[PDB]
């Protein structure tokens, strides 16, 4: 019955501090990956990352309060306020704030502040713990701060699903609105784990690229020379709004979310198989009431891992059949790196912008496509395309074998 459209976009990421900066960067095929500057990473086998740069949280909230939060909350709050400003909700007279909720997740949360506080305790004891240590690291406090800043009293919580966090949050928020528990939801993911334990943790898994002499081409999905993903940070946020509510005020509408699919591999904890991801894609298309052939663009999970990229391709073939060769796929992680919990968030934004603008962002750094390994689809290599996008799907296949697929559609 109830339909859910997108009326606001918010983004902070390695390719831009606003939605416009990012889109322009992505369409130009420019990388957001560089050498790690956040901390001394000389000891980690991976020393490259997608870092947020030139970003001032003080533009959004007070510096004194910002001081008391870990940076993943900075990214979430900033991207949320962007999306809210973008939707025009701050200018609606007699807005029913009781019907507005916030659902923003994170994969890992306040790892950098936990590391800092830990070092403080070792050196100084338990009395060096700041009074704001715990709220400054709690994942759900992103939603907490946003509701307090805006006076929203609808449902608020965070999700955690590793790489799939942002997808689950957005899909779940859409469910909430349809069920009637809210008319508006602010949803997405935020991540800030560029730290010794964060970067070093995934490196210990041998999951990260070690192309430290060529940062710009470290992330290269479906390329022959790929060797692991490049860690990234930031946040992507949507404003989801019930259609009639959107149309009553004169809201600008980017797209409609028509489908949400979920599955579990039940196989490996940190390596996606074929069937699990295929299930999620299938379930999402069913939920949307559309067929594979209707899908014009797939924003892939596309981590640039040897097994993952190839397994995702096989998963698409299972779910799409022959249309896997007709549709267009692309991984924006080729430019942004892998934002983990925030990945589903920013890539939802990009998918929606693809529909809205009629443009597909490229998978850069495809020098020799890995056809031998089965990666023989159209990954929109190396250059963006003008394309009529009516339906776009965004995939997220995360650690724990948890899968999510969002289905967006042009609104007319």
């Amino acid at each position: 019955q109830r339909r859910v459209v997108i009326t606001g976009l918010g983004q902070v990421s390695p390719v831009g501090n606003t939605v416009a900066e990012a889109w322009d960067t992505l369409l130009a095929g420019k990388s957001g990956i560089g050498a790690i500057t956040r901390f001394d990473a000389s000891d980690i086998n991976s020393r490259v990352a997608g870092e947020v740069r030139g970003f001032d949280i003080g533009q959004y909230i007070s510096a004194k309060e910002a001081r008391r939060m870990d940076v993943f909350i900075h990214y979430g709050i900033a991207a949320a306020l962007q999306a809210i400003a973008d939707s025009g909700l701050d200018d609606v007279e007699n807005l029913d704030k009781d019907r507005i909720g916030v659902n923003i997740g994170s994969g890992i949360g306040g790892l950098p502040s936990i590391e800092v506080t830990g070092k403080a305790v070792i050196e100084g004891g338990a009395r060096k713990i700041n009074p704001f240590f715990i709220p400054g690291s709690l994942i759900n406090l992103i939603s907490g701060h946003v509701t307090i800043l805006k006076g929203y009293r609808g449902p608020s919580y965070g999700m955690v699903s590793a790489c799939t966090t942002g997808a689950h949050a957005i899909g779940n928020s859409a469910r909430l609105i349809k069920y009637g528990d809210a008319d508006i939801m602010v949803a997405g993911g935020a991540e800030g784990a560029i730290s010794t334990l964060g970067v070093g943790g995934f490196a210990a898994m041998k999951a990260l690229s070690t192309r430290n002499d060529d940062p710009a081409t470290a992330s290269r999905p479906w390329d022959k020379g790929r060797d692991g993903f490049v860690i990234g940070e930031g946040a992507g946020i949507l404003v989801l709004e019930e259609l009639e509510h959107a149309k009553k005020r004169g809201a600008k509408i980017y797209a409609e979310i028509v489908g949400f699919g979920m599955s579990s591999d039940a196989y490996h904890i940190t390596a996606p198989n074929e069937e699990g991801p295929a299930l999620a894609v299938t379930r999402a298309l069913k939920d949307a009431g559309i067929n594979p052939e209707d899908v014009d663009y797939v924003n892939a999970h596309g981590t640039s891992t040897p097994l993952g990229d190839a397994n995702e391709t096989k998963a698409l073939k299972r779910a799409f059949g022959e249309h896997a060769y007709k549709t267009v796929v692309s991984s924006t992680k080729s430019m942004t790196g892998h934002l983990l919990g925030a990945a589903g968030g920013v890539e939802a934004v990009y998918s929606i912008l693809a529909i809205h603008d009629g443009k597909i962002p490229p998978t850069i750094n495809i020098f020799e496509q890995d056809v031998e390994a089965g990666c023989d689809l159209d990954y929109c290599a190396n250059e963006a395309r003008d394309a009529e996008i009516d339906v776009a799907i965004s995939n997220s296949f995360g650690f724990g074998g948890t899968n999510g697929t969002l289905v967006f559609k042009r609104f007319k």
Copy 2:
């Protein structure tokens, strides 16, 4: 119009390593709170806790497997496997595991292992990081390990809402089943933050009781002498199942979940207001289509805080009107302590058992009820009661001002 019933219970907590042990301990009014033994808490102003004791994870998984996980995962897995065994799903031939999902959350997650790893890194560099450090601390890996152990391929993720985590996980899972995305959901919360940064973190917020000389009465909800909550650890898990699916097999049904209410205070980060919690209770009852007068038992938030306990009373009076004085309230945190993200889990179990067995667990340590602060309701003080419970609600009002209310009903 699908209905959701509870066919399985699982629990690990300071009052028991099984559901039976716990329910018996609670009804006898015995405390699970003692001096902190897990680590040297000498330098922290709060040195009491609700610890899990005499618990062998090796009973559920191999030692080798366990070594790769932080303890909050241990509690989650153990409580999950308890619930799954209780429901009898392991014995159903041709069970459709594609229709079975897992949604278990945590408030903080793998804080102890992060502290351990962080120290090892300080002492020996990045090499020290175990390859299983990241998956061993990821909150969503509780669901991950359960799906893999059992072969469940339905939706899987975790939620994070602090104190309300377990409530949101259960309610959301019921919504999933109703929507049709699953027929069975394993849902609850788990927490294991009995560590320097965990206990020290909440102590730095002046949030914990400092009654270290008398651990047994440190947790005393609505008592004149209450001085902050007592931190606890553990996990509580439900097996949620669509009604016809349960009835078609020979499923034992504990109760039915008929309502789910969510709200945000939009007021204070770490201190509940009146209206926020009142909103959640009202919304839960409207969702269930039930009048306040029909509520026989309220499993309170009741963390033992000077402001929180008094505000919760005012919130109940707002939502229930005159029936605030007719119903029976009680806080099992008087015996378990506050299990954070797991609180909503174990207290859902306790609420269901109240309905099932027709008994009300007491709020112990009420020596002089704080009537002067307005705490003048019936908190089932100091001894358990036999009572016919047709409808019970369980409240969780957590940090970030996030509120969740579950409504359970006896099934016929």
